[PDB]
Design a protein around this ligand. Structure first.
Ligand code: V9K
Length: 111
């Protein structure tokens, strides 16, 4: 069972993972494979990795007790991208676009 607010969160999560946003959402689908990408400093800079597959697992496992905890993980995922990457990089542009999708729909949370 989810609260009404956690159903809204699950709706947002489904949208973030949908083909509609795939052009800019794809970097956030799975955990960053730092070694495979040659980003050998990634885990020295990012102490708390997060991605949409981990958010999905936590939602499915009823890990999130409220909307605020869900939103904290989604924003942690974007913050990690903004911390690690140069601000003019394509991946940061993709993060900004997916975060715009997230923030505008999260704002429509039922009272
Ligand atoms: C959550 N993903 C990331 O933070 C991330 C970082 C990266 C990545 O390569 N970062 C660069 C930034 C510039 C620096 O000079 C070298 C490392 C990528 C990959 C996969 C990506 C995604 C999109 C476009 C292009 C490269 O993904």
């Amino acid at each position: 069972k989810l609260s009404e607010q956690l159903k809204h969160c699950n709706g947002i999560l489904k949208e973030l993972l949908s083909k509609k946003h795939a052009a800019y959402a794809w970097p956030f689908y799975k955990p960053v494979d730092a070694s495979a990408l040659g980003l050998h400093d990634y885990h020295d800079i990012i102490k708390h990795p997060m991605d949409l597959s981990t958010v999905k697992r936590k939602m499915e496992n009823r890990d999130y007790r409220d909307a605020q905890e869900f939103a904290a993980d989604v924003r942690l995922m974007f913050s990690n991208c903004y911390k690690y990457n140069p601000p003019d990089h394509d991946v940061v542009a993709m993060a900004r676009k997916l975060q715009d999708v997230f923030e505008f729909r999260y704002a429509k949370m039922p009272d």
